[PDB]
Amino acid sequence: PLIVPYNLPLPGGVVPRMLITILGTVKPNANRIALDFQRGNDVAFHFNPRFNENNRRVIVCNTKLDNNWGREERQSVFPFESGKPFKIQVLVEPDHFKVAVNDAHLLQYNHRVKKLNEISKLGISGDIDLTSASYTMI
């Protein structure tokens, strides 16, 4: 097991065909999970399952540039459950991050930060027990 928050270095940045796999279990009565793909202080892709935003479960995705959050992209399909093991796979494609949860496609996020090679770390945080975080090329 890994200590949360966990920083996964992405040496030389991300590139198309890189697959990141995250295995963990959601804590009971979780509030949030977050993945933050970083370019220095900037957040290229923030992926943020929220378990109780005004008694709704929602995934919020966004980009933070110069300390400012941009336009949120919201997904109401919510495959995480409190107390239960999950797998998140993030596949870098030429034009977007593609995210699957428990083997099922969830969402795509168009690249707003376009210097992919500068996206050099992934932060994993939130209400989880983290089992594994790794990457491979497909």
Ligand X SMILES: CC(=O)N[C@@H]1[C@@H](O)[C@H](O[C@@H]2O[C@H](CO)[C@H](O)[C@H](O)[C@H]2O)[C@@H](CO)O[C@H]1NC(C)=O
Q: Return the number of the residue (46 or 111) whose C-beta is nearest ligand X.
A: 46
Q: Is 71 annotated as a binding residue?
A: yes
Query: DSSP readout, 49-75?
Result: EEEEETTEEEEEEEEEETTEE---EEE
Identify which of residues 33 and 133 has a Cβ nearer to ligand X in the complex: 33
Q: Which is nearer to ligand X, 68 or 136 (CB)?
A: 68
70 is an annotated ligand-binding site residue: yes
Q: Tell whether residue 69 is among the known ligand binding residues.
A: yes
Round to whole Å and give the CA distance between 57 and 53: 6
**Residue 121 phi, psi (nearest 5):** -150, 150
Which amino acid makes up residue 57?
R
* Residue sitting closest to ligand X (CB): 62
The amino acid sitting at 27 is: K
Residues forming contacts to ligand X in the complex (CB under 6 A) are 46, 48, 60, 62, 69, 72
In the annotated binding site, the residues are 69-75
